[PDB]
Design a protein around this ligand. Structure first.
Ligand SMILES: Cc1nc(N)nc2c1C(=O)C[C@@H](c1ccccc1)C2
Length: 207
């Protein structure tokens, strides 16, 4: 298991998300679903010129999986996935995100719901999650598990468990007071409100 420090600005961003008083937390789901949709777009595009890239799975969709026993909400896609390098770069650094613009915008009257405009929607997971675990598989690499409870660090390890073919699974270990997002009616409401036009099937698992 390898432990890494977030780039300073990413740590600052996560701290702002965790510590700012902001009640409209439901937008995290929209942001993760949009990330999944973008990843599905990418594998769809790549497979046009190389259909063998779908050998790891033809189906392009998004699964939402609540588990009240474990207090987790899991968002799974069969999108492009991330290599180890992709994981560390995209989740651990500013990379090509608008991290800087976002934090300046918040100081200038923007609100946290606008996080998606700045390519850092992933971090909105920390509105509702005390820990986030990300399992991912890209065609060009092995399966990896990334994990962080914030506090300035994250871990990465090779994941030799059940192979997932291709895609990304985001596991939200919910804060104690955020269990509403495990409720079928609440999830349906949020999907209908914010993600009704997503171009891929979104299946809400039942328990
Ligand atoms: C391939 C993929 N699939 C999913 N489901 N989600 C993501 C990705 C990425 O590649 C980027 C990653 C990210 C995280 C943090 C900041 C910016 C981008 C989010």
């Amino acid at each position: 298991v390898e432990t890494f420090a977030f780039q300073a600005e990413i740590a600052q961003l996560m701290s702002l998300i965790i510590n700012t008083f902001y009640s409209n937390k439901e937008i995290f789901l929209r942001e993760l679903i949009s990330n999944s949709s973008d990843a599905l777009d990418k594998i769809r595009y790549e497979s046009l010129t190389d259909p063998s890239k779908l050998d790891s799975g033809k189906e392009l969709h998004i699964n939402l999986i609540p588990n009240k026993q474990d207090r987790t909400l899991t968002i799974v896609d069969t999108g492009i996935g991330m290599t180890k390098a992709d994981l560390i770069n995209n989740l651990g650094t500013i990379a090509k995100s608008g991290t800087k613009a976002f934090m300046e915008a918040l100081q200038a009257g923007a609100d946290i719901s606008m996080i998606g405009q700045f390519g850092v929607g992933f971090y909105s997971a920390y509105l509702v999650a005390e820990k986030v675990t990300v399992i991912t598989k890209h065609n060009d690499d092995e399966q990896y598990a990334w994990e962080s409870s914030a506090g300035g660090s994250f871990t990465v390890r090779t994941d030799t468990g059940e192979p997932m073919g291709r895609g990304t699974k985001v596991i939200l270990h919910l804060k104690e007071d955020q269990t509403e997002y495990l409720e079928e009616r609440r999830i349906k409401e949020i999907v209908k409100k914010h993600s009704q036009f997503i171009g891929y099937p979104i299946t809400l698992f039942v328990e």
